[PDB]
């Protein structure tokens, strides 16, 4: 079977959508889109009755809430409900509020991977955002290699199929081998104007399309082209 | 959203209304790019709004910052006495006035002394000039101290920017999760083509609305900096 | 003798196939189907009677199992009857030792255990064929000992009569890694006016002649089918 | 705001006037660009416009810096014993007979600095060279926004205008103008060109203009512009 | 001056009559470029010719080594029994750890590779050596290259011995200076295809072609054009 | 300023008259751009011009040296006996301690401290006014930082002694600069000679980077090296592309 982004063209792109227990790399520079389109992931996610888990450690979840909110898409009912969850493995790196969810030290991946296993549980999330992945391994990069495939096993296990967002200054040392699948998000400055583009570098499990599409951010979230391509 | 108009021409018109309020914004650049002409004008034309500003200055003392603004036409000092604007020494301590960092060996007393500035003039708009020196020689200290500046700044409600110095050639923001920390990035640049050095502004990055995706020339006068949105840079300047 | 791939249009490209008791060194980027390459270059080992070896170190023996299976290549069958073998070089990396598993290296801080289970394995189904995926994750943090480890495992492999294709993780081909192994081939994924072109090319092949050309390929359902007749110059 | 004449043909009129006094002026450039003509035309000019110059040399000893300049027609030696010209020596001190003013330790800026006050106070200077400021901090560039900005703020404080020459084989941002000098080869040929990359209190020319040194020193071409590879207008 | 003759078809040509006697040449290249198969062609050519040669192993095990040149119908064994080829094992000692007349132990430095190798060129009245490769010998301590260049060398030289340095280039400080001679091996990838090219850098002692010459690799070894030249594809 | 005239074809007419007096001047270029056989053509002509010169060896040892100087109609031997020329060891001491004949040889080169003072009293002994050091990038290539003070150390000693001399720097093949930082700008003049593969052939070329005292061609000069040296030609230019 596959998971239904739902962002408008990309399943087509995926043939269908993500592989189930796939971990897709979603990569790019600054402000090319990675966010809100792992955000509409998780949101179409519970559109369909998907349970969602967002890690955030780039910012706090009340900020989340209010960046998703922004664009029509209120958790906080479902949160209620049990169907969402937001993990704080961010105050952890700025200092020190309550949540259902917080890693209090990623020194280790230890206390990371105890706290998510607990909220695919309560909610028995299906769907699980890493933003981002980037900032466990940034200033020790060779362990990079082993925590993107632990938290691989254990997300995979537990029948989740998974966005790691990982933020490039290539694709991210073993990290890109690691992942099933490779999205990535451009932002190229063409005649004078910034285009925006995505292209599905790698997906273990299916065929896909093999052409870069151009894309707009809107309103209401992403919005991909399967039927142009984009030339750089 | 809410947004802070910058006032400077052709700026809130590229960003389809203003700076969304709390956002901080990265003005990234090389040398000489009109970056802290730039944050300046965008303080003094929040002071004629009647919104508080502060100037955090770690390239030079606030003594010169007064004495180059006012020569834009840009006199802070009957705002000072008003309680309507504020200066952070910052600089001094760099190299061996109301509000002074005396030690940037963490970024501890930086944010005690920012906090007391912002309660006391009831604070909208900041500027940090710049931030790169914070962590310029701590580059793994960078994302960290952004994410924390940030928190600070948004949690007491003020829309800022943070200037970037980067090295000439490198089209960089500023590196590793600092360009990925702020909420937007707009690049200041100063390209030789064909002989002749021109100047342009691009919003690489904006949370919170849409904005232009095109390269704006714009000149920096004696009034300060005016940007051209009906125009373009494409090799050649270009109109609509 | 020629090792025959299996995979079509490679051994035309190899002009016969692999020099018995080659190491191949399968080079490229990430998505370019070195994994796939590499196990169906097994599957058709088993059905020409060579037993065959999968050193795991990027994913457990089970999904790799199953990988292989959505491809149409159940090697279960060949598991009990000795033919084919897994080892398990995989979860040393990562920390779990809750399985049970025939071959199993428990640490991957050195070689010597590496060789001890490799040897075993070959000597227990008496292999023909043996794919490391990836020999990079053996030196990936220590590029100086990359080298000696390259030509170690090269002895021992060719002293048992195998053939083998070592997948290399380019993120070149790998620091004097390219040239202690006796071929390579390089899987690329390049982006040709807004699309992505998967192709194929023999850099080195100590022993035979083999194309000097840039030949197309495509992933299908069934694998791997490169095209001999065909060349991706740059565009077309 | 005043303005400092450069007196070098040309390029006067690319800084729209000259140098804004007190402004710390950054030349940049490669080996053999004309970095050290250059900045010591600056002064020669400045000494017989009545403004005291002092030039700090960290590449030559004082001594062979005297041979270079009078070689251009360029002689001191009057300037200096009037009181008018003072060469301060922080060579010797980083490579292994008698100069008034010397700098014995380089391990870190402050006695620089203190015989930098000197020199100024003793001749009033007005103009100030240090071939080369990356001298200064080549083994410790964490160290080189500091000292940029240190000597920045004693030279503006003392009233001075100067220039910092830079070997190129926070620094860019600390100084107040930027001129770097460039040598291209195109078609087989190397040809010159300066171009004023940061000139903070003035506009200026925005263009690459070419220049040539010749026996009384450097010719710059306002009126000439380096395009591709060729010299129009 | 005393010419070398490699017997390389077009290779004596492009050197104007050969190799001058006593020369270190430096054969650098890629993995795949045709370095080893280049420099046992020289010596195979120069036992032919009444000259002793001497090969110094670092790559593959002697063993290995006759059997890749008998591959190419190069039979070293006539010439070992009677004392004019020797193959110097200076391989086992580097992956750690069988008889070799010349052996080295201790690779940790090279005076006694030094040793080895006096006394082979002393037994055989060797007139021609090749190294494969001197690049193995310091490449985990750049530092030491200049001086193990040099000294290998003056003792080269010092015994009258023409030789051949194998370098190992992966794809791209005193060596290219410290040497008489340098022959760079391309192999290079032009509109979806694979040219293999020579030229001659440096040869001191001599003129030589200043052109980039293609060549092929055959079964019975190098042979190199030099009617032909590479602009960028091959021309006249 | 009075010209050290190099002798060699088309080099003094570039250099308009010639290398100005104590002038270090830094020769760089990648292996096989000619140049040992050009720094040696230069102490040869200096000889026949009635100069003295001394060449400093640090990737030969002399006797070879000597051994290559012969194989181009340079025979220095007449002149060593004369006094009017000198070679110095620094070539044993940077691979072993072994001991040898040779008037003039520096031990140890961990210090430039001998080096200078086996140079001064090898400078001392004849009328050394020409000097040659091949190549001084041995000196500071495995201490990169030390380079500027040995450089400017040299320099110093050399021009104290009325010395013109040239600096031998080994660049790697494709390498664009001189020889870094500290290198480049200590020297008085820089003169590249380039070996570019330019339409599958590869064409030799002089150009003068730099040259304090004087002015000079700002051209790519096309040069041979040929049985008897080097010949530049003045009144030819070469296009490489860049
Ligand atoms: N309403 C909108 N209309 C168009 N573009 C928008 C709108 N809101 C936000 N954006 C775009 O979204 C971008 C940020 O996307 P985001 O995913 O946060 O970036 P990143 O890849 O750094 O995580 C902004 O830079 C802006 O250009
Ligand atoms: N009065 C003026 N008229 C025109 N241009 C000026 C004027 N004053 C300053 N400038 C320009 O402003 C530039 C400096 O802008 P600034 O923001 O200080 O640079 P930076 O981005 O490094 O902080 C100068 O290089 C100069 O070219
Ligand atoms: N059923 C399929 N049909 C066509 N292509 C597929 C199919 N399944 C997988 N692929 C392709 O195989 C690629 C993965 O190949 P793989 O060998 O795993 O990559 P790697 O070089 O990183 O080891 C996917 O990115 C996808 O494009
Ligand atoms: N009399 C002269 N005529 C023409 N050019 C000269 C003359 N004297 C020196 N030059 C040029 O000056 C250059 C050196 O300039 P200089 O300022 O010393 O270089 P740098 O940028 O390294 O400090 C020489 O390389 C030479 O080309
Ligand atoms: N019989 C043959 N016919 C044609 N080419 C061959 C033959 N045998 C080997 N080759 C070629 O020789 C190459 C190996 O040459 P070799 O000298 O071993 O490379 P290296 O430069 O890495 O030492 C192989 O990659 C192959 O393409
Ligand atoms: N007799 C000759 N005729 C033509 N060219 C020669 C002759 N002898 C030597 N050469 C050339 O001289 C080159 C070496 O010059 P050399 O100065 O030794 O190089 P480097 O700059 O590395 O010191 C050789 O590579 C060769 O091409």
Same mark, same amino acid.
């Given at each position: 079977?596959? $998971?239904?982004?739902?962002?408008?063209?990309?399943?087509?792109? %995926?043939?269908?959508?993500?592989?189930?227990?796939?971990? $897709?790399?979603?990569?790019?520079?600054?402000?090319?889109? #990675?966010?809100? +389109?792992?955000?509409?992931?998780?949101?179409?996610?519970?559109?369909?009755?998907?349970?969602?888990?967002? =890690?955030?450690?780039?910012?706090?979840? =009340?900020?989340?809430?209010?960046?998703?909110?922004? +664009?029509?898409?209120?958790?906080?009912?479902?949160?209620? #409900?049990?169907?969402?969850?937001? =993990?704080?493995?961010?105050?952890?790196?700025?200092?020190?509020?309550?949540?259902?969810? /917080?890693?209090?030290? %990623?020194?280790? /991946?230890?206390? +990371?991977?105890?706290?998510?296993?607990? !909220? *695919?549980?309560?909610?028995?999330?299906?769907?699980?955002?890493?933003?981002?992945?980037?900032?466990?391994?940034?200033? #020790?990069? !060779?362990?990079?290699?082993? *925590?993107? %495939?632990?938290?691989?096993?254990?997300?995979?296990?537990?029948?989740?199929?998974? @966005?790691?967002?990982?933020? $490039?200054?290539?694709?991210?040392?073993? $990290?890109?081998?690691?992942?099933?699948?490779?999205?990535?998000?451009?932002?190229?400055?063409?005649?004078?104007? %910034?285009?925006?583009?995505?292209? =599905?570098?790698?997906?273990?499990?299916?065929?896909?399309?093999?052409?870069?599409?151009? +894309?707009? *951010?809107?309103? #209401?979230? *992403? @919005?991909?082209?399967?039927?142009?391509?984009?030339?750089?």
């Amino acid at each position: 079977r596959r $998971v239904k982004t739902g962002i408008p063209g990309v399943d087509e792109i %995926l043939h269908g959508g993500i592989p189930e227990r796939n971990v $897709v790399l979603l990569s790019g520079g600054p402000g090319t889109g #990675k966010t809100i +389109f792992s955000q509409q992931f998780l949101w179409n996610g519970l559109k369909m009755g998907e349970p969602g888990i967002y =890690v955030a450690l780039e910012e706090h979840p =009340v900020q989340v809430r209010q960046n998703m909110a922004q +664009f029509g898409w209120d958790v906080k009912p479902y949160e209620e #409900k049990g169907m969402f969850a937001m =993990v704080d493995a961010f105050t952890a790196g700025i200092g020190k509020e309550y949540e259902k969810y /917080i890693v209090h030290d %990623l020194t280790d /991946i230890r206390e +990371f991977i105890e706290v998510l296993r607990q !909220a *695919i549980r309560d909610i028995n999330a299906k769907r699980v955002v890493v933003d981002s992945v980037t900032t466990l391994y940034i200033n #020790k990069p !060779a362990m990079a290699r082993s *925590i993107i %495939l632990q938290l691989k096993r254990v997300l995979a296990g537990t029948g989740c199929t998974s @966005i790691f967002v990982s933020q $490039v200054s290539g694709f991210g040392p073993g $990290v890109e081998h690691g992942v099933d699948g490779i999205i990535r998000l451009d932002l190229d400055e063409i005649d004078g104007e %910034l285009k925006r583009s995505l292209i =599905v570098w790698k997906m273990r499990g299916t065929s896909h399309s093999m052409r870069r599409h151009p +894309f707009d *951010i809107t309103d #209401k979230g *992403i @919005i991909v082209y399967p039927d142009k391509v984009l030339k750089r």
